[PDB]
Amino acid sequence: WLRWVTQQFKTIEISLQEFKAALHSFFAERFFALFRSGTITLQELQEALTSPMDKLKFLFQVYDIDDPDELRTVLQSCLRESAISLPDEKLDQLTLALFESADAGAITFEELRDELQRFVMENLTISAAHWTRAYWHNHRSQLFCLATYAGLHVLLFGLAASAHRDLGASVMVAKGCGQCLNFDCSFIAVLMLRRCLTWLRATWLAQVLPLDQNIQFHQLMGYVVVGLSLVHTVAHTVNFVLQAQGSASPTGVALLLLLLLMFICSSSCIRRSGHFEVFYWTHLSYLLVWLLLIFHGPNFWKWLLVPGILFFLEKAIGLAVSRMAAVCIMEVNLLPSKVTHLLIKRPPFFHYRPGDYLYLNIPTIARYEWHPFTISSAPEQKDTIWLHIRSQGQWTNRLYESFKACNIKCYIDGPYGTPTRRIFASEHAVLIGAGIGITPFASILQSIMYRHQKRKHTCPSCQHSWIEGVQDNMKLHKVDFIWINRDQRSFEWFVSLLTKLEMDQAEEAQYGRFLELHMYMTSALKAIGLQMALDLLANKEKKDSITGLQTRTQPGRPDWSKVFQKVEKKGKVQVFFCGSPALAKVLKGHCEKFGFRFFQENF
Amino acid sequence: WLRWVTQQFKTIEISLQEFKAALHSFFAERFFALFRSGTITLQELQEALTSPMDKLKFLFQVYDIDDPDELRTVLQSCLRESAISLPDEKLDQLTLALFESADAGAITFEELRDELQRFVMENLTISAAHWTRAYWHNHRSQLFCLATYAGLHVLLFGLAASAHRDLGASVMVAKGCGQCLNFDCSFIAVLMLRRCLTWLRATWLAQVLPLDQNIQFHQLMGYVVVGLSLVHTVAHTVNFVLQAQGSASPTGVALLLLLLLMFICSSSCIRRSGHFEVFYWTHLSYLLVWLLLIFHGPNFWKWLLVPGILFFLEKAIGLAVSRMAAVCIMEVNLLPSKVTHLLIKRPPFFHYRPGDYLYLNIPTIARYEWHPFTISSAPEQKDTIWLHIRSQGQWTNRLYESFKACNIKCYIDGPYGTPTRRIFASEHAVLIGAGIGITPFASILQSIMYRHQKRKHTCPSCQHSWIEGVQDNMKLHKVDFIWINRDQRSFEWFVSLLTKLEMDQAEEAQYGRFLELHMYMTSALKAIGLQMALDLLANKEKKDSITGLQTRTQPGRPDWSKVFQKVEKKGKVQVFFCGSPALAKVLKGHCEKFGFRFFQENF
Ligand SMILES: Cc1cc2nc3c(=O)[nH]c(=O)nc-3n(C[C@H](O)[C@H](O)[C@H](O)COP(=O)(O)OP(=O)(O)OC[C@H]3O[C@@H](n4cnc5c(N)ncnc54)[C@H](O)[C@@H]3O)c2cc1C
Ligand SMILES: Cc1cc2nc3c(=O)[nH]c(=O)nc-3n(C[C@H](O)[C@H](O)[C@H](O)COP(=O)(O)OP(=O)(O)OC[C@H]3O[C@@H](n4cnc5c(N)ncnc54)[C@H](O)[C@@H]3O)c2cc1C
Ligand SMILES: NC(=O)c1ccc[n+]([C@@H]2O[C@H](COP(=O)([O-])OP(=O)(O)OC[C@H]3O[C@@H](n4cnc5c(N)ncnc54)[C@H](OP(=O)(O)O)[C@@H]3O)[C@@H](O)[C@H]2O)c1
Ligand SMILES: NC(=O)c1ccc[n+]([C@@H]2O[C@H](COP(=O)([O-])OP(=O)(O)OC[C@H]3O[C@@H](n4cnc5c(N)ncnc54)[C@H](OP(=O)(O)O)[C@@H]3O)[C@@H](O)[C@H]2O)c1
Ligand code: HEB
Ligand code: HEB
Ligand code: HEB
Ligand code: HEB
Ligand SMILES: CCCCCCCCCCCC
Ligand SMILES: CCCCCCCCCCCC
Numbered sequence A, B: 001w002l003r004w005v006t007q008q009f010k011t012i013e014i015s016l017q018e019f020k021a022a023l024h025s026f027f028a029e030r031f032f033a034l035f036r037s038g039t040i041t042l043q044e045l046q047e048a049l050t051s052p053m054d055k056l057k058f059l060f061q062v063y064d065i066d067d068p069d070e071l072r073t074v075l076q077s078c079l080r081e082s083a084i085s086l087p088d089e090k091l092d093q094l095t096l097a098l099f100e101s102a103d104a105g106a107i108t109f110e111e112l113r114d115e116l117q118r119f120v121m122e123n124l125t126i127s128a129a130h131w132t133r134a135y136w137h138n139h140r141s142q143l144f145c146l147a148t149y150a151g152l153h154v155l156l157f158g159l160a161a162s163a164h165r166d167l168g169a170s171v172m173v174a175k176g177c178g179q180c181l182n183f184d185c186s187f188i189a190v191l192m193l194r195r196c197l198t199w200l201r202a203t204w205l206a207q208v209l210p211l212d213q214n215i216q217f218h219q220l221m222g223y224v225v226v227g228l229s230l231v232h233t234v235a236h237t238v239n240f241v242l243q244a245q246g247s248a249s250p251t252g253v254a255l256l257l258l259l260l261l262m263f264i265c266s267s268s269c270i271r272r273s274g275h276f277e278v279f280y281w282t283h284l285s286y287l288l289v290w291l292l293l294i295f296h297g298p299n300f301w302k303w304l305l306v307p308g309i310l311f312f313l314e315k316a317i318g319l320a321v322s323r324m325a326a327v328c329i330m331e332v333n334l335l336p337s338k339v340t341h342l343l344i345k346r347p348p349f350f351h352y353r354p355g356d357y358l359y360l361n362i363p364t365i366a367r368y369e370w371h372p373f374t375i376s377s378a379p380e381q382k383d384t385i386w387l388h389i390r391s392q393g394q395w396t397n398r399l400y401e402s403f404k405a406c407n408i409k410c411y412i413d414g415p416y417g418t419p420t421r422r423i424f425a426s427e428h429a430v431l432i433g434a435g436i437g438i439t440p441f442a443s444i445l446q447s448i449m450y451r452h453q454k455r456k457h458t459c460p461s462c463q464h465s466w467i468e469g470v471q472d473n474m475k476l477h478k479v480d481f482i483w484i485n486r487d488q489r490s491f492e493w494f495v496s497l498l499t500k501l502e503m504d505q506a507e508e509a510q511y512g513r514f515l516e517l518h519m520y521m522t523s524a525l526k527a528i529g530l531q532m533a534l535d536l537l538a539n540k541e542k543k544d545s546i547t548g549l550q551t552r553t554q555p556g557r558p559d560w561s562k563v564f565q566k567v568e569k570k571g572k573v574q575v576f577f578c579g580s581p582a583l584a585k586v587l588k589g590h591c592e593k594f595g596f597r598f599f600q601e602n603f
């Protein structure tokens, strides 16, 4: 009640207030001025925080200044936090359309209220700001892996401790740290196999067990090896000093030097520099570490055997003939937001399902480094195979920098990935876009469009075109694309491709639509009447000015899930999603009531 | 010279002569009578063995008896060793056609000579009979596997012998036989894995190393295990008797009993009876043999480990969910020559390349027995998947007998086999039929015919049909089928299917032929003018009377290889064969001169 109002007042410097009000900013300054002479009196805040008619009148007063200034105000709003990256040339047309829709003098409060009610008023907002047990429980409810490693470490430490309890306070620590080190130095290698991980990635084992964070888990076990080796060294030295009142010590010293080298020369700072050769050559010293530790520990080979032989087999299966091939880059083009687009020539013998990935390796950038990239070209394209890479690290950033200022060697190794025959062998399989790996969705869309157009048979004689039914390739009659991601900051390639496919199939939607686009932001701006300008623009040119697409990029977080529940039926409809377990689980639980054979969280 | 004639006479009883002359036999008796009063005088043999005019006159005299009898003679010749299984109803038409072609009186020797010269005369023959270092070198020039096993056995026996030479004449034999037995009892199991063998079958390792005889090699090592175990037992007993002047002996006795049981109850005689359950249950005692031999030999577990764990993994990978599935037989039909044809319902999720195989298992016949069968139905058939089985053993014979006098459970386990994308992604890939596994060729032919007809697009509006080009499925323009096998004794299903496909595509050969058939026997009858009757019959009904097909089943062993060399070119022609290494090697060596990318001996 009144106490709540007092607390809100206590929660509350014009420039400081503007800065703290989530600034863009002429509109913000005008609103702050309209919010008297300028003071910290709580009456203005109470009035602002308190029917929709008053809010509409306040908004109308804020928009005006005493109505050509609205065009300048509209331009400022576009350049504001709305992130509307549009040219100023179209601003005149948008302002003219808005003035025509509003004035028909543009100072009429009643006209503004009617225009607002045409589309809202209840959502009277003028700001977006307010003015680790739960997270761990939520994340660990499906991970349950770090605790297992900790339990193994502790049980091994205790088991070695009970075996040397008689020795006094120094050698039992040594033995426990030692046994932990056999375990760690034996299995930190079996973590990383780039070959079998792909084979395991396409199974329910990968569905239940996370895989994509194996780099960070491997680095974490490297760190614990370093720490435990240091404490083991200190314990053995303090034991020797106590005894002070020839191969073991020198071999331990050599192992310590090797681990210190591998820790120093494999940190993030080294690979920040373009000395990938230095990192790889220093990091090839794992063989020397294993060889030294063989005849350093009495029973290290027992631990080393199984993972050692299995990793030796995994590395020995890779030859130039076995998987590798020589591919020459044909054309490379750089797109905005530091995304590089490659056009590698298709080898004569390469049949790949859509959505598969491959590992690229450019000798010029990194001589012996391999990174996975997802194919962004349809399998029906016989000329070139595309690859799309976003600069989210150093090596990709290195490629972008190098190509900033072509026939260079490239090596690709086969297609790998989950089979996509289930999507084509379905009826109205809707695809939901989430996460950062939305590259395979472009391949799937291109393949589906190509197969759809291949059945558009036209008779050359009488110029009659009749559509044949499904023929042994796909069984879909309609596909729905729904994209729910952080932004379109780096996916200009993907936006362009989806827009291209959309108006390529838009010429065929008069008799029946085949592809639907639902593009969401959930972070765009509602609270400011910027969409009023675009309302007329969308029908002015039959395409959104921000995208040049039939879809106008509607935001909305939960209403998208509700529409997914309310998604027309061309057959046994199926729902497929790809993202974090939270959103996928919510969508599945909502979808389970509707009786749909939906394999949600498929990725 | 004259000495050769004397030797030929020495190489030489009218009934006995007829029996030894490769009898069918009225024609044989007439020839023997025509060959005087009947004696062993060498003048008749000298005349017979010695221009084509004399041979033609002799043949004309033999055919006649003093010409309606020729029809009876023709019928006898058809029923003779020619193996012409044709009805007597068509004999009248054939005899009438032959008489019309010959007489126009049918006793004119000059007319017979002219008719023979029309088609021969130089190949004047009236008989087909004459009147292990080389084989081992030829076979072992590519096998080199039994010698390796013998060498391993001998080196192990010698190694154990040198380790116990001090012991007197009895225990060194024991130790050598023992070490040989660890080796044998460890690897006789790693021979047989029905899972990894399929994975290895599709590689060049299977191309160089034979695989299909693993049953017989496994049985041979079982036999040597039995023999060496018996001699080991005798040696240890004679050692103990010498010492005669408690777990080892009883465990050895138990192992001896188990091996004797497994030898007795797994012989051919037991499975000759329909007691497959008895064989399988008695043969499940290998686990007991291994368990007893673990704590019977001091160092048997070292040998047992790797093959034991690997076989345990191979058997543990097989579950009902993992590979197995429930399939109900829809229709079963029995064809002549003891071949059974099955029509099993296609499971909803089953995509298989043509030519793949599967393992059938009928609980009614054998509860826990598995045998591989090759799919004889095109992948484009969505209704049922075929299987063709020839009664070449007991279990198949058991199935034939049981179905001689349906909804029974059947279990299939996936498709396995070499990929066939290379055939479709080629130009004029000619297929050569040899060996006994010609079942996948029917699947390949059906798939190629179906894909060829799927591009025969006809406009419904104006009834105009235009053929489209190759579309992402195959790149062939012409396929040639050449069949060089022992007979058509059991392949009536395959003959019917190829004939069906041929006249299905015969309606499209006027503008361009798509499938060519070259059916050979190399064992049929030349020497007897039976083909004269069929010469008119072939054009009488546009189909051979023996087959009802455009092809008339031409024989000829080496001329087929010459024609394969002289095989028209619709693109980059490729040659594929399947059979024993001899014929395939000859065909490849002949083909290498022509510069054809032929992967001969592909099977
Ligand atoms: C199977 C797979 C396919 C991918 N496909 C694409 C794609 O098509 N387009 C795209 O823009 N991004 C893709 N990524 C994400 C990422 O951009 C790529 O893995 C890229 O190779 C990053 O390399 P980097 O040199 O920048 O890594 P770094 O900058 O050296 O490492 C930092 C980041 O890269 C990851 N990383 C580093 N090394 C590896 C490695 N060996 N394996 C996996 N992750 C590693 C780390 O987890 C971390 O997130 C994919 C990731 C995976 C696992
Ligand atoms: C991969 C493969 C696919 C085959 N496909 C066909 C087909 O489609 N049609 C056809 O008519 N024949 C086929 N055969 C040949 C043979 O007829 C089948 O293997 C059939 O299962 C014979 O079983 P059986 O009970 O008569 O064997 P048995 O009578 O018990 O054994 C005698 C013969 O069968 C073979 N044999 C026995 N057990 C096995 C086994 N477990 N694995 C392999 N061979 C064995 C022996 O080598 C010997 O030649 C195939 C063989 C193989 C290896
Ligand atoms: N290999 C992989 O697939 C992989 C690897 C690592 C992590 N991940 C996933 O990626 C996540 C990190 O990326 P993220 O947080 O951006 O994605 P996310 O966790 O998969 O999804 C959460 C985001 O989805 C959006 N969202 C929520 N409800 C929505 C609705 N009704 N309609 C539309 N969008 C809705 C929200 O806004 P925004 O759209 O603005 O974000 C929210 O931030 C991780 O939590 C994990 O789930 C995947
Ligand atoms: N899994 C397998 O693929 C498998 C397994 C075991 C054995 N095999 C092969 O099968 C063989 C046993 O069967 P097989 O001897 O009947 O076949 P084959 O050895 O493959 O072929 C030999 C036969 O080919 C025929 N032939 C020779 N020259 C010919 C020509 N120019 N044109 C047409 N035919 C010609 C001959 O008469 P016929 O046609 O009257 O025989 C000859 O008997 C083995 O030697 C081995 O090569 C294959
Ligand atoms: C035990 C031994 C060892 C150790 C000690 C280690 C230690 C370590 N680690 Fe290591 N790694 C290893 C073993 C190792 N490691 C190996 C072997 C490899 C290769 C890969 C695979 O395996 O696959 C690696 C790899 C690796 C990587 C990647 C590379 C590539 O990819 O190329 C990384 C990042 C790491 C990290 C690490 C670190 C940071 C450390 C320190 C702390 N590594
Ligand atoms: C690389 C990691 C590492 C390192 C760094 C080290 C370092 C060392 N080290 Fe060592 N160790 C080890 C690893 C190690 N290490 C282990 C793991 C063990 C346990 C045992 C085995 O392994 O077997 C030991 C153990 C050990 C021993 C023994 C114990 C028993 O036996 O129980 C000794 C004497 C030692 C010494 C040493 C020294 C003195 C040093 C410093 C110089 N070393
Ligand atoms: C070392 C142990 C052992 C031994 C002693 C034997 C001995 C023998 N073996 Fe034995 N097996 C065996 C181990 C064996 N095994 C096994 C484990 C099997 C199963 C199969 C597999 O592995 O996969 C058989 C299997 C078997 C078979 C097939 C069956 C089925 O498939 O189901 C046969 C035929 C035999 C034979 C034989 C004989 C005849 C003998 C006597 C001589 N084989
Ligand atoms: C199953 C097959 C078999 C059988 C049948 C047998 C049978 C027998 N066994 Fe014997 N063992 C054996 C297998 C055997 N086993 C072997 C493999 C050996 C070598 C050693 C091990 O294993 O480790 C022996 C060895 C042996 C020994 C020891 C020698 C050494 O240590 O060097 C003895 C004492 C015996 C006894 C015996 C007897 C007395 C008999 C008869 C009863 N074998
Ligand atoms: C910090 C996240 C830890 C995730 C651990 C991943 C474990 C991967 C196991 C791979 C087994 C082959
Ligand atoms: C009598 C013919 C002997 C053939 C030997 C075959 C050997 C098969 C080796 C299989 C290795 C997995």
Ligand SMILES: CCCCCCCCCC
Pocket (backbone or CB within 6 Å): A150, A153, A154, A180, A220, A224
């Ligand atoms: C035996 C001690 C293991 C410690 C593991 C701690 C993991 C921390 C992850 C941030």
Ligand SMILES: CCCCCCCCCC
Pocket (backbone or CB within 6 Å): B150, B153, B154, B180, B220, B224
């Ligand atoms: C150690 C003795 C091995 C004998 C092998 C003989 C093989 C014969 C194949 C017919």
Ligand SMILES: [Zn+2]
Pocket (backbone or CB within 6 Å): A459, A460, A461, A462, A463, A464, B459, B460, B461, B462, B463, B464
């Ligand atoms: Zn037409």
